[PDB]
């Protein structure tokens with residue numbers, strides 16, 4: 001109850017103590033992060049970023065196909081040179097198919113979403129390899145791509161070896 | 165100049181102090197936030213969120229059209245009931261046309277991107293109004309939508325009144 005009132009109250013405390021007003025547009029680490037919208041992940045705390053360090057791109061499952069527009073802008077307009085892709089344990093995108101979510105939209109809203117692809121995946125590590133390989137194969141992405149699993153159970157980032 | 169070594173070292177410190185392993189999938193505030201990938205914005209600090217409070221969806225310019233997949237999953241599978249859309253001052257998406265970025269891709273990569281739409285906007289407040297009205301008009305989004313501008317120069321969230 002009162003989300004808008006609470007975030008505006010918290011913001012007033014943040015703004016009172018804020019001195020980071022001079023930070024420039026290009027990220028200092030020339031880095032873009034692609035990860036899940038998952039509420040339990042604070043990317044800045046997990047990776048030790050401060051304001052101005054890295055682009056942080058977030059979507060349901062941290063899918064690289066959807067991140068690509070954001071990555072091209074990140075690199076071509078704002079100078080980033082590197083991408084990290086982070087999926088996580090206990091991701092919602094493991095727990096349904098396109099058919100299951102289309103059914104839930106019909107059941108709850110009475111709407112047809114048969115032509116929208118929701119990009120769920122069947123295996124966590126396979127999803128990271130598919131995404132990293134996708135970005136390595138793109139002619140529109142420059143630089144090294146690294147894949148990780150974040151363990152929501154212990155706060156650990158686990159780097160994955162992705163062959164090819 | 166060793167991004168992967170730096171974030172792995174910082175993560176090892178974060179994991180040593182980590183207590184939050186029992187948090188569940190559904191966000192506690194039943195809230196999804198849509199904002200820019202901009203490096204200077206730590207959404208958790210700006211809004212006073214803790215791990216497990218709100219979904220955080222981020223893309224170049226915080227465009228609601230691209231967030232829609234993520235919002236539908238957030239609401240239908242993970243129980244969120246409300247959306248906040250935050251654009252920001254000094255956003256890169258104000259500073260180019262699709263034809264300007266297509267030129268940079270030709271100059272730097274020697275690639276043609278004439279079939280990709282990058283979704284820049286011409287006016288910051290109009291961009292927030294368009295994105296809020298887009299989500300309010302969608303038959304696949306339930307609940308209240310609020311628009312904000314985040315002022316990168318002063319750390320201030322400014323709520324916009326958006327009609328019809």
Ligand SMILES: [Zn+2]
Nearest residue numbers: 036038091092
């Ligand atoms: Zn997830």
Ligand SMILES: [Zn+2]
Nearest residue numbers: 200202255256
């Ligand atoms: Zn921006």
